[PDB]
Amino acid sequence: DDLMLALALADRADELTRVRFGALDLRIDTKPDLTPVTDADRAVESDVRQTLGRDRPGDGVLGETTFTGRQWIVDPIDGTKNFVRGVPVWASLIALLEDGVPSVGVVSAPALQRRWWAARGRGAFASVDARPHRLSVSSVAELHSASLSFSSLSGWPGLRERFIGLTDTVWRVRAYGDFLSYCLVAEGAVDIAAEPQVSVWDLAALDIVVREAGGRLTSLDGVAGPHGGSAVATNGLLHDEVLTRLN
Amino acid sequence: HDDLMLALALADRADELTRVRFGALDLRIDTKPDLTPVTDADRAVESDVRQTLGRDRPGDGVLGEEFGGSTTFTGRQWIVDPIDGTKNFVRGVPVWASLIALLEDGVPSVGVVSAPALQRRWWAARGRGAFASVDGARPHRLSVSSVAELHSASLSFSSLSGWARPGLRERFIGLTDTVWRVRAYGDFLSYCLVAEGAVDIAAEPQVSVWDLAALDIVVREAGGRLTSLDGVAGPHGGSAVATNGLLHDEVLTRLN
Numbered sequence A: 001d002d003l004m005l006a007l008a009l010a011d012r013a014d015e016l017t018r019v020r021f022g023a024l025d026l027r028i029d030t031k032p033d034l035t036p037v038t039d040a041d042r043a044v045e046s047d048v049r050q051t052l053g054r055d056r057p058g059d060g061v062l063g064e065t066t067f068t069g070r071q072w073i074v075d076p077i078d079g080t081k082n083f084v085r086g087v088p089v090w091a092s093l094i095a096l097l098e099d100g101v102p103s104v105g106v107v108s109a110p111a112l113q114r115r116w117w118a119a120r121g122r123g124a125f126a127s128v129d130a131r132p133h134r135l136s137v138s139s140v141a142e143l144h145s146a147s148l149s150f151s152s153l154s155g156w157p158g159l160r161e162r163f164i165g166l167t168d169t170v171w172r173v174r175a176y177g178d179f180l181s182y183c184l185v186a187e188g189a190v191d192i193a194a195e196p197q198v199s200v201w202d203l204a205a206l207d208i209v210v211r212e213a214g215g216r217l218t219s220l221d222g223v224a225g226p227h228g229g230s231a232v233a234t235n236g237l238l239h240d241e242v243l244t245r246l247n
Numbered sequence B: 001h002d003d004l005m006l007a008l009a010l011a012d013r014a015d016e017l018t019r020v021r022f023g024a025l026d027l028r029i030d031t032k033p034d035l036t037p038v039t040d041a042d043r044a045v046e047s048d049v050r051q052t053l054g055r056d057r058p059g060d061g062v063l064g065e066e067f068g069g070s071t072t073f074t075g076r077q078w079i080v081d082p083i084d085g086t087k088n089f090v091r092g093v094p095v096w097a098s099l100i101a102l103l104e105d106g107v108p109s110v111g112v113v114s115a116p117a118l119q120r121r122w123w124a125a126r127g128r129g130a131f132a133s134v135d136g137a138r139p140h141r142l143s144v145s146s147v148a149e150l151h152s153a154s155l156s157f158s159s160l161s162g163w164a165r166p167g168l169r170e171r172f173i174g175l176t177d178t179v180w181r182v183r184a185y186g187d188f189l190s191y192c193l194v195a196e197g198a199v200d201i202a203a204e205p206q207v208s209v210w211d212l213a214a215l216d217i218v219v220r221e222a223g224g225r226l227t228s229l230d231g232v233a234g235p236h237g238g239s240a241v242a243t244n245g246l247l248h249d250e251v252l253t254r255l256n
């Protein structure tokens, strides 16, 4: 019901973001100008607000501060720095919060031809370009067997040294970055995802997807959910050992 | 008589076999993954490629990552890695690809990188440019970026662990602190993104000819440069740094 609406919002967001991603000039000789991404961000937000005004009068809308009632939170493009360079790891993130708790989430990555979604009590799913498949986190129980995806080293000299130690301990390390690390945890394809500095707009949809897939997502101090300023997602089995190594 | 057309047809056949094997995987896992089904798929694709090239190019040598072969540094030599990214393949991560190249006189002249679970293919031929297609839409011609300052550059690598062996770990981490953006898309994908101009630097400290030959012609035809860490041009140097060409000498200098 809210999930069906969230998936329809993602359909509309994808139509707008696809066109703007395709229209970019990717020739570049310096740091990229984020103006076309900001422009796309504004167009998606406007469309989302217009639809929710029609279909959910009296739901609040937050676009990338007080959490009350039913509130939709949208990050039209997560991975803006990828979007602007022509790297297709970017997605719209759409969540419904009830009293600040993600209850519906959609992660829509049109240039990866992929979507992930979840709703409380109804499981998590992914599609590639194409029937949905139900998601489940892995059963990897030992850190030395685990696969980890992060974003970069620079955001982490104590916590940096500890993070690098975790990367030396696990079986496999990659940095697919942003939302994609967390979505791969939910699919069971990766075991650990971590980012040291990340906002509620970037975590809300991922929180419900990971939880419905059987995993855990907490801040670095182990507090559940998307509000803690940092995010560690695991299959749940590895969670305590990861927080211990990082703390 | 078109070697590029044959290479793209080998990729079509490889993709039909790898799609089936990727789709059939048991993804339940509770330890390090059992590579056996991936090793089997890897070997089956190589065998099929060898059988086709035996039929369509009977004098040509074929050097494969799974069955080996002699190298000729002078004749025509096909070099294939049927599945690059097998540790992704086995876990259900779709970053994996068949890499197919022809060398003439030691130099990659045709290359195809085929990633069916990313719905993507990259290819190039000497003098004829580099191209990519996404979900079999029309090809687009590739061009590396024009980023000239390291501090504005985007870098993609694989992992940190392989850097200690040549003694470069501290230097590599220093490069990651210098550039504008760091990711690790890993394997062939870092280099393909350099060719598209979406990333500026790709680096790996240990890479075989099978893993570099197709990437070498794609990067070159896109306007970039791919060398070993010690500056040897091409896929035979044992390590690989690919850039947009502008950043090349500064990257090699920072890494040593």
Ligand SMILES: [Zn+2]
Pocket: A064, A075, A077, A078, A079, A201, A202
């Ligand atoms: Zn964001």
Ligand SMILES: [Zn+2]
Pocket: A078, A079, A178, A179, A202
């Ligand atoms: Zn982000």
Ligand SMILES: [Zn+2]
Pocket: B042, B065, B066, B081, B082, B083, B084, B085, B086
């Ligand atoms: Zn292989």
Ligand SMILES: [Zn+2]
Pocket: B065, B081, B083, B084, B085, B210, B211
């Ligand atoms: Zn390989």
